[PDB]
Amino acid sequence: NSNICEVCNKWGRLFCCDTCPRSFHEHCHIPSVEANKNPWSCIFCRIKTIQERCPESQSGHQESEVLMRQMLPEEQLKCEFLLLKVYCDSKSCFFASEPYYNREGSQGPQKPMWLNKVKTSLNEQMYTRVEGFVQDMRLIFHNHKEFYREDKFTRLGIQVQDIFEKNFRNIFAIQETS
Ligand SMILES: [Zn+2]
Ligand SMILES: [Zn+2]
Ligand SMILES: [Zn+2]
Q: Staple 60 to which of 41, 50, 70, 175, CB 3.0 to 4.6 Å?
């Protein structure tokens, strides 16, 4: 197994996947690494199994159809994994914890949002459809773009949004377009 956490790339107290060589800190894995279960399979393995059981799940989909899906167990897992993929980028640190807004010439957003809040919301089963999760994720970056205006710091929002969107299209097998 790897000797660093797959998500944050640090060593420490790691839990090892029994079906691939990845390792995780307890609260870096999403959901948090389970108390027992021997063997244990990580989220990357669980996602791979879904695809393998239903190869046609990788045929292309319309975003509008994906968003309206109810958050049954497999859609819940896919959103957990998509959230994890954003945390895997080190630039996610800027969007992880609750922000605050005091900048000359800007007003804070009406509805602040951050990754840890989405993480809690998923854990507490607060989203009933995929749309709920995706709207909150996109809101994180949209709030950032609006607040930071012409500062070059706006680019961090663009960059982390691109990681989100690429992973969304991959995980949910969105039909490729130009
Ligand atoms: Zn970690
Ligand atoms: Zn694994
Ligand atoms: Zn099938």
A: 175
Q: Answer whether 134's CB lies under 8 Å from 178's CB.
A: no
Name the E strands within the chain: 15-16, 23-24
Q: CB–CB of 167/86 below 8 Å?
A: yes
What's the CA gap between 63 and 148, in Å, rounded?
28
Cα–Cα dist 87/30, whole Å: 10
86 CA distance to ligand 3 middle (Å)? 28
70 forms beta bridges with 129
Residue 26 buriedness (CB in 10 A; 0-12 / 13-18 / 19+)? middle
Experimental technique used? Answer: X-ray
CATH tag, 60-178: 1.20.920.10
Rounded to the nearest whole angstrom, what is the distance from the C-alpha of residue 76 to the centroid of ligand 2? 18
Number of H helices, E strands in the chain: 7, 2
How far is the centre of ligand 2, averaged over its atoms, from the C-alpha of 23 (Å)?
A: 8
Q: How far is the CA of 110 from the centre of ligand 2 (A)?
A: 39
Span from the CA of 142 to the centroid of ligand 3 (angstroms): 36
Listed residue (140, 138, 133, 139) closest to 119, CA to CA? 133
Residues in the chain: 178
